[PDB]
Amino acid sequence: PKIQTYVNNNVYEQITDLVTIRKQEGIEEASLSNVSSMLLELGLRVFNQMEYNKLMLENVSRVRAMCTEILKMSVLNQESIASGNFDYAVIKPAIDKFAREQVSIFF
Amino acid sequence: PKIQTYVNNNVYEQITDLVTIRKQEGIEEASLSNVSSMLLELGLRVYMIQQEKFNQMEYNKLMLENVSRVRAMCTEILKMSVLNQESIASGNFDYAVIKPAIDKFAREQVSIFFPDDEDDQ
Amino acid sequence: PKIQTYVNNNVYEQITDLVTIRKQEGIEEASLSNVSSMLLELGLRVYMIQQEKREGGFNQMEYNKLMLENVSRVRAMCTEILKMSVLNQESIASGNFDYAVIKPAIDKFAREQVSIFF
Amino acid sequence: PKIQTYVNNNVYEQITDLVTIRKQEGIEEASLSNVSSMLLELGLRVYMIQQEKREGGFNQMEYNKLMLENVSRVRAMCTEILKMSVLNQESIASGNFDYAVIKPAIDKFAREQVSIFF
Amino acid sequence: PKIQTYVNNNVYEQITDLVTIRKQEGIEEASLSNVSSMLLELGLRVYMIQQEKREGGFNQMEYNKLMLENVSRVRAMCTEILKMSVLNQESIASGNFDYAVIKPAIDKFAREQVSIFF
Amino acid sequence: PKIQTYVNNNVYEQITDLVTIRKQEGIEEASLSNVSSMLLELGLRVYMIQQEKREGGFNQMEYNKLMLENVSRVRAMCTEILKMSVLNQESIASGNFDYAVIKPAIDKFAREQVSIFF
Amino acid sequence: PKIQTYVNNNVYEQITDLVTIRKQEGIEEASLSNVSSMLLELGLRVYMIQQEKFNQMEYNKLMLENVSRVRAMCTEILKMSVLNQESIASGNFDYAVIKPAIDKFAREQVSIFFPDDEDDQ
Amino acid sequence: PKIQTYVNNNVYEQITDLVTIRKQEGIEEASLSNVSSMLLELGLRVFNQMEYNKLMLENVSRVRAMCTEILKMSVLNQESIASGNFDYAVIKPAIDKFAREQVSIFF
DNA sequence: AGATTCGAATCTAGATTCGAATCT
DNA sequence: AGATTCGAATCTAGATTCGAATCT
């Protein structure tokens, strides 16, 4: 479907400018209608990999902070002290070591 | 100056929809060109912003670290919770049971997506 | 760019069959070239993947699997830790951590979060 | 039988690259059609395999969904566990786990981390 | 050379109808352009013909008609002349021009001649 | 609706010629598509008319056939008439219609005439 | 030297048919290329001849003349045959009858191809 | 269907020569296979407008000669002489005149 | 002897773009 | 305002040509 818009000289300049910019970036097939279409699409906008990646990174980061703290408090629990097996000076680097080895599997 | 753009059916619908919406809001003089113009103006404004300003691998790496870290931490926290008197008392958190149960849970879950008998691919 | 491949009768049948299959699935615009392109794309990906394999890593699939495990594991572990925390005298005392409330609340949180993207 | 597929520049490059690679490996008779044929054959095989698998092999979207749930679940659970740990007498005693300090600190951590990539 | 015409819905229907009609008559390769071309060719011919008309002559059709008349006329006339020649005493005398023989002989000649080209 | 027809150079010339002709007749808005449309319309009308006619209007082949028959018939008839005229007493008398002279003369005439064009 | 020609199904059939024909005539060594070669040789020979050497309008004109001439001549011959005593005697060749009959014949014949109610075209 | 013939150098030259000749005559799309095909077609050959036009011209020409002669003899028939209406010095030019007028209708 | 591969190429087919233009 | 004409153009689609080449 084709659209005819009557725009002001400002808008017009900016667009024809964009077309130029593009061709100049190899984007051969850049065109007036071509570019206005992209701009309309963009204007309208104003699942989702990026938005999703973001949420997951937050949740994971959050969980990690929380567990760090929980860990420290568990270590302070009398029953833990008693066992003699949860000395934070040991567990902690052990955990770091685990993470590093794991990461290194893939990087 | 007049612009002729050839857009797809999606875009077109959305716009003609907007024109309708507007007239319906008293905005008498709402029109196709009229509204597209406003939308173009809007799109330009953003485009500029984007102009004036994502690494998978680095991100995959951070996530693997955080997750691995969290897993190590929980393993430890779990062991300590089991040691808590109230846990001992309940008789429901025998590590020798819970622990393999958890391994079992992990395996079944992984196998939903990475059934062993569907390997090589 | 256009490619001309001379394939055997097997391959040919299979593909023309696929075109049929598709149109038959509403996929109107299914075509010979159309489908072969998709198949080439597919074949390349595996070739690459196989390639990447016998070299060093990396390996999306292996990674997706490890993350799913760790995440699943963590989730089982927290479930259990949660239940034990609830049993802690100090928790009982506060009257703010009844499993019969927290638990569904957590379920509720998960659902709303998932529904953001689904 | 001969196939004409109209592929994109990516695919095209990759293939012409493969032809090069091969001749360079002694594979004299390597050719465009030649190689695309082999790639088609390959692509078909996988398509079949996927076809067979189970709802048809791995499923990005279904997997993304599971992971989002597990992670969200875990986060809700930890928030609660955290609150209960803070209530543990030994925690109160240390004076180091004032939930009102820790909490914003955790939020702060999250934000800085996300901002690394976004 | 390719032509792009913007026609009205009437014309369009009629043509797409013709394509249908054709395929339906075995004419496998019938197509839109295909048929429009034939129609253009046809339209030109009439245009020319009409043209040629209001100018001077010439005029295949008018000519074909006049020749068919003259030929037909001649044929009727000869039939009659033949019958009268047969009645001429000198013919009777010769014993070589019995209608019951000549006539079928003539029919025979005509048929063989026609069958050369049909 | 828009039509794309792939025509031959003849047709194409004729049309582009017509466009020229028209503009030259003041018909400002004459155009390629413009004119082809008018020609299509025209072509359709005739096609219809032919359709209606009777076995569908004039028929070259059927006509060629009739003419060949009539002409062949006439020729057989005349050959016979000629032989009988020669037998007429008045002919014998004149000494000018010896069938053995006339006959080759006629053959000779035919040959020279045909050779004008062949 | 070898030639690759892409011919139509007609031509191809005809040739492969010829090969068959030949072998069937003892011509053992008959072959596709074999026979096409012979056919090419043959085609060249003719082509040359044609090389070393039709006007519709002029021809239409000659034919119209001859036919018209023949028609005038027959009209006259007809009139004379009618005058022949033997014709008079038969009572079957009254020009007043034959003549319109002949006109009738012509008209009906023309109308087979140039029905009056199908004019203008 | 494609044919591979192994020809001698003579034939080959003649053909490649023909291809050249043609291109040189504007016949852009002239080609080896292209031309050999035409030559095969031709070789094999060794209704029909031309053949038909020929036969019709013969028959008509023949008929015309014959009628001329028949005409002359009819004129000699006593009954014709008697009528006084078939004087060859009159009829004949009359016939010529008819033919000319008829031809002139179309040329 | 002819099957078959190969890739540059040309063509009819028709969907779709583009922007200049005229008339609402 | 937007309908519509116009013709240059580009693209996917697949049939068909061409001749150089290798293997029967």
Side-chain angles (χ1 to χ4, degrees), chain H residues 50-73:
Chain H
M50 222 45 58
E51 210 58 56
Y52 169 96
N53 293 158
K54 184 173 165 167
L55 214 216
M56 295 285 288
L57 177 59
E58 178 193 342
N59 277 347
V60 161
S61 265
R62 220 153 202 130
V63 165
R64 181 210 162 151
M66 282 186 294
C67 291
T68 301
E69 291 304 301
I70 294 166
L71 184 70
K72 293 189 207 146
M73 290 175 288

Coordinates of all heavy atoms in Angstrom, one line a residue, chain H residues 50-73:
Chain H
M50 N 3.5 -21.9 -50.9 CA 4.1 -21.7 -52.1 C 3.8 -22.8 -53.1 O 3.4 -22.5 -54.3 CB 5.6 -21.6 -51.9 CG 6.3 -20.5 -52.7 SD 5.4 -18.9 -52.6 CE 5.4 -18.6 -50.9
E51 N 3.8 -24.0 -52.7 CA 3.5 -25.1 -53.6 C 2.1 -25.0 -54.1 O 1.8 -25.3 -55.2 CB 3.7 -26.4 -52.8 CG 4.1 -27.5 -53.8 CD 5.4 -27.2 -54.5 OE1 6.4 -26.9 -53.9 OE2 5.4 -27.3 -55.8
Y52 N 1.2 -24.5 -53.2 CA -0.2 -24.3 -53.5 C -0.4 -23.2 -54.4 O -1.2 -23.3 -55.4 CB -0.9 -24.1 -52.1 CG -2.4 -23.6 -52.3 CD1 -3.4 -24.5 -52.2 CD2 -2.7 -22.3 -52.4 CE1 -4.7 -24.1 -52.3 CE2 -4.0 -21.8 -52.6 CZ -5.0 -22.8 -52.5 OH -6.3 -22.3 -52.6
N53 N 0.1 -22.0 -54.1 CA 0.1 -20.9 -55.0 C 0.5 -21.3 -56.4 O -0.2 -21.0 -57.4 CB 1.0 -19.8 -54.6 CG 0.5 -19.1 -53.3 OD1 1.3 -18.5 -52.6 ND2 -0.8 -19.2 -53.0
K54 N 1.5 -22.1 -56.5 CA 2.0 -22.6 -57.8 C 0.9 -23.4 -58.6 O 0.6 -23.1 -59.7 CB 3.3 -23.4 -57.6 CG 3.9 -23.8 -58.9 CD 5.3 -24.5 -58.6 CE 5.7 -25.2 -59.9 NZ 7.2 -25.6 -59.8
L55 N 0.4 -24.4 -57.9 CA -0.6 -25.3 -58.5 C -1.8 -24.5 -59.0 O -2.3 -24.7 -60.1 CB -1.1 -26.3 -57.5 CG -1.5 -27.7 -58.1 CD1 -2.7 -28.2 -57.3 CD2 -1.8 -27.6 -59.6
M56 N -2.3 -23.5 -58.2 CA -3.4 -22.7 -58.6 C -3.1 -21.8 -59.8 O -3.9 -21.7 -60.7 CB -3.8 -21.8 -57.4 CG -4.3 -22.6 -56.2 SD -6.0 -23.2 -56.5 CE -6.9 -21.7 -56.5
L57 N -1.9 -21.3 -59.8 CA -1.5 -20.5 -61.0 C -1.5 -21.3 -62.2 O -1.9 -20.9 -63.3 CB -0.1 -19.8 -60.7 CG 0.4 -19.0 -61.9 CD1 -0.6 -17.9 -62.3 CD2 1.7 -18.4 -61.7
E58 N -1.0 -22.5 -62.1 CA -1.0 -23.4 -63.3 C -2.4 -23.7 -63.7 O -2.7 -23.5 -64.9 CB -0.3 -24.7 -63.0 CG -0.3 -25.7 -64.1 CD 0.1 -27.1 -63.7 OE1 0.7 -27.2 -62.7 OE2 -0.2 -28.0 -64.5
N59 N -3.2 -24.2 -62.8 CA -4.5 -24.6 -63.2 C -5.3 -23.4 -63.8 O -5.9 -23.5 -64.9 CB -5.3 -25.1 -62.0 CG -5.0 -26.6 -61.8 OD1 -4.4 -27.3 -62.7 ND2 -5.4 -27.1 -60.6
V60 N -5.2 -22.2 -63.2 CA -5.9 -21.1 -63.7 C -5.3 -20.7 -65.1 O -6.1 -20.4 -66.1 CB -5.7 -19.9 -62.8 CG1 -6.0 -18.6 -63.6 CG2 -6.6 -20.0 -61.6
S61 N -4.0 -20.7 -65.3 CA -3.4 -20.3 -66.5 C -3.8 -21.3 -67.6 O -4.1 -21.0 -68.7 CB -1.9 -20.3 -66.4 OG -1.4 -19.0 -66.1
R62 N -3.9 -22.6 -67.2 CA -4.3 -23.6 -68.1 C -5.7 -23.4 -68.6 O -6.0 -23.5 -69.8 CB -4.2 -25.0 -67.4 CG -3.7 -26.1 -68.2 CD -3.0 -27.1 -67.4 NE -2.1 -27.8 -68.2 CZ -0.8 -28.0 -67.9 NH1 -0.3 -27.6 -66.8 NH2 0.0 -28.7 -68.8
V63 N -6.6 -23.2 -67.6 CA -8.0 -23.0 -67.9 C -8.2 -21.8 -68.8 O -8.9 -21.8 -69.8 CB -8.8 -22.7 -66.6 CG1 -10.1 -22.1 -66.9 CG2 -8.9 -24.0 -65.8
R64 N -7.4 -20.7 -68.6 CA -7.5 -19.5 -69.4 C -7.1 -19.8 -70.9 O -7.8 -19.4 -71.8 CB -6.7 -18.4 -68.9 CG -6.7 -17.2 -69.8 CD -5.5 -16.4 -69.7 NE -5.4 -15.5 -70.9 CZ -4.8 -14.3 -70.8 NH1 -4.2 -14.0 -69.7 NH2 -4.7 -13.6 -71.9
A65 N -6.0 -20.6 -71.1 CA -5.6 -20.9 -72.4 C -6.7 -21.7 -73.1 O -7.1 -21.4 -74.2 CB -4.3 -21.7 -72.4
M66 N -7.2 -22.7 -72.4 CA -8.2 -23.6 -72.9 C -9.4 -22.8 -73.3 O -9.9 -23.0 -74.4 CB -8.5 -24.8 -71.9 CG -7.5 -25.9 -71.9 SD -8.0 -27.3 -70.8 CE -8.0 -26.6 -69.2
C67 N -9.9 -22.0 -72.5 CA -11.1 -21.2 -72.8 C -10.9 -20.3 -74.0 O -11.9 -20.2 -74.8 CB -11.6 -20.4 -71.6 SG -12.2 -21.4 -70.3
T68 N -9.8 -19.7 -74.1 CA -9.5 -18.9 -75.3 C -9.8 -19.7 -76.5 O -10.5 -19.3 -77.4 CB -8.0 -18.5 -75.3 OG1 -7.7 -17.7 -74.1 CG2 -7.8 -17.6 -76.5
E69 N -9.2 -21.0 -76.5 CA -9.4 -21.8 -77.7 C -10.8 -22.2 -77.9 O -11.4 -22.2 -79.0 CB -8.5 -23.1 -77.6 CG -7.1 -22.9 -77.7 CD -6.7 -22.2 -79.0 OE1 -7.0 -22.7 -80.0 OE2 -6.1 -21.1 -78.8
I70 N -11.5 -22.6 -76.8 CA -12.9 -23.0 -76.9 C -13.7 -21.9 -77.4 O -14.6 -22.1 -78.3 CB -13.4 -23.4 -75.5 CG1 -12.7 -24.7 -75.0 CG2 -14.9 -23.7 -75.5 CD1 -12.9 -25.0 -73.5
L71 N -13.4 -20.7 -76.9 CA -14.1 -19.5 -77.4 C -14.0 -19.4 -78.9 O -15.0 -19.2 -79.6 CB -13.5 -18.2 -76.8 CG -14.2 -17.0 -77.2 CD1 -15.6 -16.9 -76.5 CD2 -13.4 -15.8 -76.7
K72 N -12.8 -19.5 -79.4 CA -12.6 -19.3 -80.8 C -13.4 -20.4 -81.6 O -14.0 -20.0 -82.6 CB -11.1 -19.4 -81.2 CG -10.3 -18.3 -80.7 CD -8.9 -18.3 -81.2 CE -7.9 -17.7 -80.3 NZ -6.6 -18.4 -80.4
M73 N -13.4 -21.6 -81.1 CA -14.2 -22.6 -81.8 C -15.7 -22.4 -81.7 O -16.5 -22.6 -82.7 CB -13.8 -24.0 -81.4 CG -12.4 -24.4 -81.9 SD -11.8 -25.9 -81.4 CE -11.4 -25.6 -79.6

